[PDB]
Amino acid sequence: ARTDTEHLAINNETGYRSFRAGGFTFTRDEYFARLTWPGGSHIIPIDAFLRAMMRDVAWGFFYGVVNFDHVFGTINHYGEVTMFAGRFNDAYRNAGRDHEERFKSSALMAVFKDILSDWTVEGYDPFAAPMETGLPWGIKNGNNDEAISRQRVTARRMVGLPGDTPVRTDANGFPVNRQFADVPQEQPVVEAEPGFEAEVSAYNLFGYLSRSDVTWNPSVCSVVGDSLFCPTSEEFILPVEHGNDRCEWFLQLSDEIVWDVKDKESGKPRARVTARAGDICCMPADIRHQGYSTKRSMLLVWENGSPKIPQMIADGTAPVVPVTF
Amino acid sequence: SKARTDTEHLAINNETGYRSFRAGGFTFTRDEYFARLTWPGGSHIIPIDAFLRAMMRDVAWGFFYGVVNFDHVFGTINHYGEVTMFAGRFNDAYRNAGRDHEERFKSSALMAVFKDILSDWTVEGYDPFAAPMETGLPWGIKNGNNDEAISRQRVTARRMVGLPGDTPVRTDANGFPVNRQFADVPQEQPVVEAEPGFEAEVSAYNLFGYLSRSDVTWNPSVCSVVGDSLFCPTSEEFILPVEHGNDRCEWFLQLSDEIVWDVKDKESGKPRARVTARAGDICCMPADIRHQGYSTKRSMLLVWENGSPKIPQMIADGPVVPVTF
Amino acid sequence: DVVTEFGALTDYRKGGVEIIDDDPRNYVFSNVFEVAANAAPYERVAVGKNFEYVIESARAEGTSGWFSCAHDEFVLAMDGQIEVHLLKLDNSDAYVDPDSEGAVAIGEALPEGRKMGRIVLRRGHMALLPVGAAYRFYAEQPAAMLFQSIEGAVTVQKWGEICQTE
Amino acid sequence: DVVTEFGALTDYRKGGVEIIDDDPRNYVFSNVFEVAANAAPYERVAVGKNFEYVIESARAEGTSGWFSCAHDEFVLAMDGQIEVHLLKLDNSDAYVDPDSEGAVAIGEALPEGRKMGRIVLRRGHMALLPVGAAYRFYAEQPAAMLFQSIEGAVTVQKWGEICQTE
Ligand SMILES: [Fe+3]
């Protein structure tokens, strides 16, 4: 599992740095992320690229396969990470033209962070919806390190508990997003008996989500064993096609989303799933998915975080769908 | 079974401010971020910049030669007088499942509705014929229009730019300044000395100069004619907004700089090749593939077309590479 | 004039799966309000499952019997006002088998222990249900809720009744 | 500061075809500057064909013979000063079969007719070669040029050895 990465030259015309990770090569210009590897090249619009990179960075390579698109992406092996071109593309694979390299995670993570920092310019936030931020086009112009560096937020037990991750307020840096301005903010009435003020806990979760400053970022709010409630606020398009190595459930809390559903292995379209407020559905472990959301909307992503699942799905000792009827 | 002509203006949404449209069994709605299409038994979303850029080309090109794929799902096939509009016709996932849908229209009826869509959905300061760095954004609620940018005069030489009565050369005075990204291209006219009496047929002009002044992107445009052989150069920046599946060979001669062409199978949509072209490179795009170009810097491209109507009839039985090698 | 759409027992609008090449049963698609609307009060119907873990939908109406659990649970109010009472059990082992999972229906009778406190949830509010507490709900009006938990003696599975199949 | 890259006989950077699943030969890929650097003076090499129609590349060097054609043609200068001479023929059926197509080489002797005009082309300049005219070129230094014409008596097809076969 490879470790070799490298900073190359700042280009004199564009002002950006190119980077290397194994056989892979990363170059940006005014419009494009340019990728090469042994035997191949590919291009991705710089805005779509940075948005995807932003997620893969923030999510620590996430669960399973993070497809930037139909060619390029990562597989997470939890401590090691596969970078690929065309691994989940019928055309490359049938032709034996896909290319894969495996890395220690903190070593790929490091060059990814360097790419994201160098390639991001003043006023461009790749964690936000396009209506909320500026543009990535043109030569290197300053940076946006504050935006690409927000601290991941994770509950040990539940938001708001003594010593656990806290509630979001104007005070502490999280005002309500313009597209959730009507969302009620009152906290639930909590009244503990003397001695119990630590165990008697409630919070306004929809108010919490309305105060999320990024889009498409599942973030832990409550924990029961490996069962994790990861709600987030969603706007525009999920900047990746997620092929999970486990089943995952979506509960639409507000407004609506359409999930474009494709085959995980081939990338052939399979179904389109429209979800409104209170709809709950399952994403099978043999699909990849990508959501589209016009108004900023509240989604609950529900995960089982157990390490056991992938090898069981491969072995067939757990199912591709959690129930049948 | 005739070709259809049933199109319709639908309602004006009160919050979006946009009108929606029917053409046969297809419906067109746009909101803040998306173009939302329907047809009996299916639905699809395309982000609105991409859609409007693609729509611009289909209209300006009068439906072009053969297949104009807006994306992996939606597009038109030109039949020259009539036109098919499809969902999934060249997507093996849809075809295999009997889920592709096609509707044949009279071209005049289908064009009128596109222009209406294009007019209504284009807002102040958004020019869908320009590169992204040259113009504003299409996002958000209806806000004015930009009918001038979408009403541009098609320009076609009958014999050659500059001949008497033929399409004129471009200058600042007739409203065509040099594009910012061609600032260093020489602009002198060639020296022409006609003898008394022959000033009609002694003609030459500065073609690169002419291209340097093109005010639109990805718009093949006739500069010279010999029977069916057409010189159709244009200026190229960013990404060609569609994937072109031609019904005959088209030739590309790269005149300046650099383009990379993403080559896919025309039926299935599978990656087949990537063609890199620099100044002086000439290649054939065979009738069995679709292509999509990438140009970082604004570049000059000569598209050479054989405009003869006999060819689609013959390239169906006999020879997709037009060269005996 | 921003409107953030939320569902209610009374007013929701189910979406669904459009097929290209797939079986709609694979997405196990339902709507929590619908499921809560048809059930018996406090009946915990599972709407999501992943190995042993579950999400449960239920309608709160009147006063529930008592519950306790060998692990933590969480409750998310989704519509209308729900009151939660907490009691610290003197011997939680007497109501809940320790090696068990999922909530336990521990009876309508007041169990022995002391008063932990009281919570009042409206739409969008989440509460801790800590292991070792017994808990009880009161809703004056029909309200909906979800439980983050594990399948046990209280959880009702009826996938074919509630999910899209065409 | 903006630099627009044009090729030349002396300075060109051929690109090419990367294969995923296909045959490079389908793309008939060559570079007009290389083709012309390797040809003899004024040899017209086909670099594009589409049925009858051609694009031809040539290196102009010194003074060519005279040409005429049964149909319009066009010449595009690609690199360097090329001089064009036009003569209206008294009797063009005397040199070019009409109903033939493609340029005819009509010898180096001055054809019978009237002086029509002179054109001096540089890189990026295009000129009409009108039907019923006789034309010739002078180039002080090697220069690259392209014809839009039809497959005829001067058209040279070196297909397998100008294009990218691997
Ligand atoms: Fe996912």
PDB file of N, CA, C and O in Angstrom, chain D residues 49-84:
ATOM      1  N   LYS D  49     -10.236  13.176 -46.788  1.00  0.00           N
ATOM      2  CA  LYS D  49     -11.152  12.794 -47.882  1.00  0.00           C
ATOM      3  C   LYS D  49     -12.563  12.588 -47.382  1.00  0.00           C
ATOM      4  O   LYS D  49     -12.777  11.999 -46.316  1.00  0.00           O
ATOM      5  N   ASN D  50     -13.528  13.075 -48.142  1.00  0.00           N
ATOM      6  CA  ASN D  50     -14.923  12.733 -47.866  1.00  0.00           C
ATOM      7  C   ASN D  50     -15.654  12.556 -49.180  1.00  0.00           C
ATOM      8  O   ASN D  50     -16.066  13.545 -49.786  1.00  0.00           O
ATOM      9  N   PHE D  51     -15.797  11.297 -49.606  1.00  0.00           N
ATOM     10  CA  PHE D  51     -16.240  10.934 -50.960  1.00  0.00           C
ATOM     11  C   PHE D  51     -15.313  11.575 -51.995  1.00  0.00           C
ATOM     12  O   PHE D  51     -14.120  11.342 -51.893  1.00  0.00           O
ATOM     13  N   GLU D  52     -15.820  12.355 -52.961  1.00  0.00           N
ATOM     14  CA  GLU D  52     -14.983  13.024 -53.983  1.00  0.00           C
ATOM     15  C   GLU D  52     -14.073  14.096 -53.390  1.00  0.00           C
ATOM     16  O   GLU D  52     -12.976  14.361 -53.898  1.00  0.00           O
ATOM     17  N   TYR D  53     -14.571  14.750 -52.348  1.00  0.00           N
ATOM     18  CA  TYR D  53     -13.946  15.959 -51.831  1.00  0.00           C
ATOM     19  C   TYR D  53     -12.641  15.715 -51.063  1.00  0.00           C
ATOM     20  O   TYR D  53     -12.473  14.671 -50.398  1.00  0.00           O
ATOM     21  N   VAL D  54     -11.729  16.681 -51.155  1.00  0.00           N
ATOM     22  CA  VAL D  54     -10.453  16.594 -50.423  1.00  0.00           C
ATOM     23  C   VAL D  54     -10.034  17.904 -49.722  1.00  0.00           C
ATOM     24  O   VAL D  54     -10.468  19.004 -50.087  1.00  0.00           O
ATOM     25  N   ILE D  55      -9.210  17.743 -48.696  1.00  0.00           N
ATOM     26  CA  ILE D  55      -8.324  18.774 -48.244  1.00  0.00           C
ATOM     27  C   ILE D  55      -6.974  18.171 -48.624  1.00  0.00           C
ATOM     28  O   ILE D  55      -6.779  16.949 -48.494  1.00  0.00           O
ATOM     29  N   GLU D  56      -6.103  19.011 -49.181  1.00  0.00           N
ATOM     30  CA  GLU D  56      -4.763  18.619 -49.638  1.00  0.00           C
ATOM     31  C   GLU D  56      -3.760  19.510 -48.912  1.00  0.00           C
ATOM     32  O   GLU D  56      -3.996  20.715 -48.778  1.00  0.00           O
ATOM     33  N   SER D  57      -2.644  18.945 -48.457  1.00  0.00           N
ATOM     34  CA  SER D  57      -1.572  19.774 -47.916  1.00  0.00           C
ATOM     35  C   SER D  57      -0.421  19.850 -48.915  1.00  0.00           C
ATOM     36  O   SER D  57      -0.154  18.865 -49.598  1.00  0.00           O
ATOM     37  N   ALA D  58       0.250  21.005 -49.007  1.00  0.00           N
ATOM     38  CA  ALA D  58       1.424  21.135 -49.863  1.00  0.00           C
ATOM     39  C   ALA D  58       2.447  22.142 -49.325  1.00  0.00           C
ATOM     40  O   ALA D  58       2.074  23.087 -48.594  1.00  0.00           O
ATOM     41  N   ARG D  59       3.723  21.934 -49.694  1.00  0.00           N
ATOM     42  CA  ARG D  59       4.798  22.873 -49.407  1.00  0.00           C
ATOM     43  C   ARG D  59       5.061  23.665 -50.667  1.00  0.00           C
ATOM     44  O   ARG D  59       5.470  23.103 -51.703  1.00  0.00           O
ATOM     45  N   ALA D  60       4.861  24.971 -50.577  1.00  0.00           N
ATOM     46  CA  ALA D  60       5.163  25.818 -51.692  1.00  0.00           C
ATOM     47  C   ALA D  60       6.635  26.186 -51.567  1.00  0.00           C
ATOM     48  O   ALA D  60       7.102  26.558 -50.479  1.00  0.00           O
ATOM     49  N   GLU D  61       7.353  26.106 -52.692  1.00  0.00           N
ATOM     50  CA  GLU D  61       8.789  26.389 -52.723  1.00  0.00           C
ATOM     51  C   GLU D  61       9.215  26.852 -54.124  1.00  0.00           C
ATOM     52  O   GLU D  61       9.130  26.098 -55.112  1.00  0.00           O
ATOM     53  N   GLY D  62       9.680  28.090 -54.220  1.00  0.00           N
ATOM     54  CA  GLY D  62       9.961  28.647 -55.531  1.00  0.00           C
ATOM     55  C   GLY D  62       8.646  28.800 -56.264  1.00  0.00           C
ATOM     56  O   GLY D  62       7.607  29.117 -55.626  1.00  0.00           O
ATOM     57  N   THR D  63       8.683  28.548 -57.574  1.00  0.00           N
ATOM     58  CA  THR D  63       7.574  28.874 -58.486  1.00  0.00           C
ATOM     59  C   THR D  63       7.000  27.597 -59.027  1.00  0.00           C
ATOM     60  O   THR D  63       7.737  26.807 -59.590  1.00  0.00           O
ATOM     61  N   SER D  64       5.698  27.370 -58.867  1.00  0.00           N
ATOM     62  CA  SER D  64       5.094  26.110 -59.352  1.00  0.00           C
ATOM     63  C   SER D  64       4.770  26.175 -60.845  1.00  0.00           C
ATOM     64  O   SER D  64       4.874  27.235 -61.448  1.00  0.00           O
ATOM     65  N   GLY D  65       4.321  25.064 -61.428  1.00  0.00           N
ATOM     66  CA  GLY D  65       3.684  25.101 -62.759  1.00  0.00           C
ATOM     67  C   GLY D  65       2.352  25.855 -62.714  1.00  0.00           C
ATOM     68  O   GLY D  65       2.020  26.466 -61.710  1.00  0.00           O
ATOM     69  N   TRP D  66       1.593  25.833 -63.809  1.00  0.00           N
ATOM     70  CA  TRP D  66       0.272  26.450 -63.830  1.00  0.00           C
ATOM     71  C   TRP D  66      -0.783  25.392 -63.570  1.00  0.00           C
ATOM     72  O   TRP D  66      -0.608  24.209 -63.915  1.00  0.00           O
ATOM     73  N   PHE D  67      -1.879  25.814 -62.948  1.00  0.00           N
ATOM     74  CA  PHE D  67      -3.003  24.926 -62.674  1.00  0.00           C
ATOM     75  C   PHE D  67      -4.276  25.543 -63.223  1.00  0.00           C
ATOM     76  O   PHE D  67      -4.343  26.766 -63.350  1.00  0.00           O
ATOM     77  N   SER D  68      -5.274  24.707 -63.514  1.00  0.00           N
ATOM     78  CA  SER D  68      -6.663  25.168 -63.694  1.00  0.00           C
ATOM     79  C   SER D  68      -7.629  24.051 -63.293  1.00  0.00           C
ATOM     80  O   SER D  68      -7.223  22.883 -63.186  1.00  0.00           O
ATOM     81  N   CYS D  69      -8.903  24.385 -63.107  1.00  0.00           N
ATOM     82  CA  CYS D  69      -9.850  23.412 -62.566  1.00  0.00           C
ATOM     83  C   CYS D  69     -11.245  23.600 -63.183  1.00  0.00           C
ATOM     84  O   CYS D  69     -11.555  24.681 -63.685  1.00  0.00           O
ATOM     85  N   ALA D  70     -12.080  22.557 -63.167  1.00  0.00           N
ATOM     86  CA  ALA D  70     -13.415  22.671 -63.790  1.00  0.00           C
ATOM     87  C   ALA D  70     -14.395  23.260 -62.796  1.00  0.00           C
ATOM     88  O   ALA D  70     -15.543  23.501 -63.132  1.00  0.00           O
ATOM     89  N   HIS D  71     -13.938  23.481 -61.568  1.00  0.00           N
ATOM     90  CA  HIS D  71     -14.793  23.996 -60.496  1.00  0.00           C
ATOM     91  C   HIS D  71     -13.957  24.904 -59.570  1.00  0.00           C
ATOM     92  O   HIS D  71     -12.737  24.748 -59.511  1.00  0.00           O
ATOM     93  N   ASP D  72     -14.594  25.831 -58.864  1.00  0.00           N
ATOM     94  CA  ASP D  72     -13.935  26.637 -57.816  1.00  0.00           C
ATOM     95  C   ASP D  72     -13.060  25.755 -56.909  1.00  0.00           C
ATOM     96  O   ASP D  72     -13.374  24.561 -56.696  1.00  0.00           O
ATOM     97  N   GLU D  73     -11.962  26.332 -56.417  1.00  0.00           N
ATOM     98  CA  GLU D  73     -11.144  25.752 -55.333  1.00  0.00           C
ATOM     99  C   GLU D  73     -10.766  26.877 -54.375  1.00  0.00           C
ATOM    100  O   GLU D  73     -10.965  28.043 -54.685  1.00  0.00           O
ATOM    101  N   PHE D  74     -10.206  26.542 -53.214  1.00  0.00           N
ATOM    102  CA  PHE D  74      -9.737  27.569 -52.297  1.00  0.00           C
ATOM    103  C   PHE D  74      -8.389  27.173 -51.720  1.00  0.00           C
ATOM    104  O   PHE D  74      -8.127  26.002 -51.540  1.00  0.00           O
ATOM    105  N   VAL D  75      -7.540  28.153 -51.427  1.00  0.00           N
ATOM    106  CA  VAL D  75      -6.247  27.870 -50.835  1.00  0.00           C
ATOM    107  C   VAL D  75      -6.098  28.665 -49.519  1.00  0.00           C
ATOM    108  O   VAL D  75      -6.402  29.880 -49.445  1.00  0.00           O
ATOM    109  N   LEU D  76      -5.687  27.953 -48.473  1.00  0.00           N
ATOM    110  CA  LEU D  76      -5.430  28.555 -47.182  1.00  0.00           C
ATOM    111  C   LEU D  76      -3.934  28.454 -46.835  1.00  0.00           C
ATOM    112  O   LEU D  76      -3.406  27.359 -46.696  1.00  0.00           O
ATOM    113  N   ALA D  77      -3.268  29.599 -46.698  1.00  0.00           N
ATOM    114  CA  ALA D  77      -1.860  29.677 -46.301  1.00  0.00           C
ATOM    115  C   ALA D  77      -1.723  29.344 -44.834  1.00  0.00           C
ATOM    116  O   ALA D  77      -2.387  29.937 -43.991  1.00  0.00           O
ATOM    117  N   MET D  78      -0.839  28.403 -44.527  1.00  0.00           N
ATOM    118  CA  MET D  78      -0.741  27.947 -43.177  1.00  0.00           C
ATOM    119  C   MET D  78       0.512  28.419 -42.449  1.00  0.00           C
ATOM    120  O   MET D  78       0.558  28.309 -41.242  1.00  0.00           O
ATOM    121  N   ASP D  79       1.515  28.937 -43.168  1.00  0.00           N
ATOM    122  CA  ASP D  79       2.809  29.317 -42.577  1.00  0.00           C
ATOM    123  C   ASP D  79       3.710  29.935 -43.636  1.00  0.00           C
ATOM    124  O   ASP D  79       4.304  29.186 -44.419  1.00  0.00           O
ATOM    125  N   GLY D  80       3.836  31.265 -43.667  1.00  0.00           N
ATOM    126  CA  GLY D  80       4.780  31.903 -44.581  1.00  0.00           C
ATOM    127  C   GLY D  80       4.180  32.570 -45.803  1.00  0.00           C
ATOM    128  O   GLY D  80       3.095  32.221 -46.283  1.00  0.00           O
ATOM    129  N   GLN D  81       4.891  33.544 -46.336  1.00  0.00           N
ATOM    130  CA  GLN D  81       4.410  34.269 -47.508  1.00  0.00           C
ATOM    131  C   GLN D  81       4.323  33.442 -48.825  1.00  0.00           C
ATOM    132  O   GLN D  81       5.335  32.969 -49.359  1.00  0.00           O
ATOM    133  N   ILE D  82       3.106  33.285 -49.334  1.00  0.00           N
ATOM    134  CA  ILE D  82       2.877  32.638 -50.636  1.00  0.00           C
ATOM    135  C   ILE D  82       2.222  33.627 -51.632  1.00  0.00           C
ATOM    136  O   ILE D  82       1.147  34.200 -51.351  1.00  0.00           O
ATOM    137  N   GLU D  83       2.869  33.823 -52.783  1.00  0.00           N
ATOM    138  CA  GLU D  83       2.337  34.682 -53.856  1.00  0.00           C
ATOM    139  C   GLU D  83       1.447  33.879 -54.862  1.00  0.00           C
ATOM    140  O   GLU D  83       1.830  32.757 -55.293  1.00  0.00           O
ATOM    141  N   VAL D  84       0.266  34.434 -55.195  1.00  0.00           N
ATOM    142  CA  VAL D  84      -0.694  33.787 -56.121  1.00  0.00           C
ATOM    143  C   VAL D  84      -0.924  34.619 -57.374  1.00  0.00           C
ATOM    144  O   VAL D  84      -1.262  35.785 -57.278  1.00  0.00           O
TER     145      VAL D  84
END
